[PDB]
Design a protein around this ligand. Structure first.
Ligand code: HEM
Length: 154
């Protein structure tokens, strides 16, 4: 797929808003993922003892991991689809070490969109939502192609 120059502009405009509070966004996104799809929590040995939202919000290490996730995702989005070199280390760890199906990437894409609405109620319209969905779909499609390049069925 291909985004218009105007769609990338929208994605990068919304991402500047994330970059102003990376830790807050990343913490909310992982908690939403875990509450919506508790099976994903079992993939995190360090976090699977957390059982309630209130324990999750008090974990400093969960927040740190949020920053890690969004920092990587931001570097990719800023490439406006010219991201092959950034995807390779990511596909490698997620396919071969963590053993994350592409389905779980759809789940965290849903959590990102939900948290962007929850944190930016008047700043994230249908046009920006559509552009971000396209950019995240482009990401998931290209990382599924990198899983296959590595010999895995995501
Ligand atoms: C936007 C999608 C994602 C991005 C950019 C991302 C990025 C990262 C990065 C940068 C790391 C640390 C380095 C590494 O191991 O590669 C990491 C670790 C990890 N990721 Fe992801 N990730 C994503 C989605 C997911 C999902 C949906 C899952 C599981 C449900 C997952 C499972 C894990 C696990 C288990 C680790 C190791 C955690 C630990 O340190 O204990 N990732 N991820």
């Amino acid at each position: 797929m291909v985004l218009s120059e105007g769609e990338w502009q929208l994605v990068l405009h919304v991402w500047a808003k994330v970059e102003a509070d990376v830790a807050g966004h990343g913490q909310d996104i992982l908690i939403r993922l875990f509450k919506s799809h508790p099976e994903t929590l079992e993939k995190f040995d360090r976090f699977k003892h957390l059982k309630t939202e209130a324990e999750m919000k008090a974990s400093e290490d969960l927040k740190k991991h949020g920053v890690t996730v969004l920092t990587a995702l931001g570097a990719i989005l800023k490439k406006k689809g010219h991201h092959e070199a950034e995807l390779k280390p990511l596909a490698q760890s997620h396919a071969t070490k963590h053993k994350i199906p592409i389905k779980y990437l759809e789940f965290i894409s849903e959590a990102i969109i939900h948290v962007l609405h929850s944190r930016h109620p008047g700043n994230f319209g249908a046009d920006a939502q559509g552009a971000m969905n396209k950019a995240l779909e482009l990401f998931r499609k290209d990382i599924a192609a990198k899983y296959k390049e590595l010999g895995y069925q995501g």
